[PDB]
Amino acid sequence: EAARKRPGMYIGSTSERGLHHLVWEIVDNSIDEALAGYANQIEVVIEKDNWIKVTDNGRGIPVDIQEKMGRPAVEVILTVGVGSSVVNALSQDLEVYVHRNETIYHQAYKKGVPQFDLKEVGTTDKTGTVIRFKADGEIFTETTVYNYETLQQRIRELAFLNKGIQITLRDERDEENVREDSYHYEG
Ligand SMILES: CO[C@@H]1[C@@H](OC(N)=O)[C@@H](O)[C@H](Oc2ccc3c(O)c(NC(=O)c4ccc(O)c(CC=C(C)C)c4)c(=O)oc3c2C)OC1(C)C
């Protein structure tokens, strides 16, 4: 309720500017993984009902119990790095899927509140993190619709700034017209 009561301090504004900042924070975490030498592919998806899906082929947010807290690391990071917690707090629903240790780990949240303990929901050969979120309509009272062009412009800049990372943007809001933009700069 720290981020919810005063959302201005944590993200900036609750307008369209603050709405797209939700996406930048989540993507910045995937770019960090790529800069460390552990990811090379990031995918930003605008899904039905303006849900956002950000996927990377990183190491997967660790799932091991943190000795002090007594909870998995993914839970800790997302419910306070600071940025992911704020996005979680400002979202009416947030889902995380971690692909690590040949297992698929899942946790869902509501307004930053864990709905259930981290559960194992599958098996994998791949590593990476999938973060799905729906912005809180009660917080973002102006608009809850992402402007594709605003997303495309910053994604193009980030792929250019961070050479060698493939960043893809896909709009799937209307199944009748699916637009996609793939960026990858060697230079
Ligand atoms: C929001 O989570 C972000 C990550 O987001 C994404 N997209 O992967 C990413 O930006 C970055 O990811 C890191 C940052 C550091 C390590 C890292 O130092 C690792 N080394 C380990 O073997 C390890 C194993 C277990 C463990 O709990 C920790 C420390 C825990 C951390 C950093 C959450 C480290 C590792 O496996 O994964 C790491 C990962 C995936 O830091 C987070 C967790 C805040």
Swiss-Prot record:
It is found in: Cytoplasm. It comes from the Bacteria. A type II topoisomerase that negatively supercoils closed circular double-stranded (ds) DNA in an ATP-dependent manner to modulate DNA topology and maintain chromosomes in an underwound state. Negative supercoiling favors strand separation, and DNA replication, transcription, recombination and repair, all of which involve strand separation. Also able to catalyze the interconversion of other topological isomers of dsDNA rings, including catenanes and knotted rings. Type II topoisomerases break and join 2 DNA strands simultaneously in an ATP-dependent manner. Belongs to the type II topoisomerase GyrB family. Heterotetramer, composed of two GyrA and two GyrB chains. In the heterotetramer, GyrA contains the active site tyrosine that forms a transient covalent intermediate with DNA, while GyrB binds cofactors and catalyzes ATP hydrolysis. Few gyrases are as efficient as E.coli at forming negative supercoils. Not all organisms have 2 type II topoisomerases; in organisms with a single type II topoisomerase this enzyme also has to decatenate newly replicated chromosomes. This is DNA gyrase subunit B. The lineage of its organism: Bacteria, Bacillati, Bacillota, Bacilli, Bacillales. The chain holds residues 26 to 231 of 644 of the full protein.
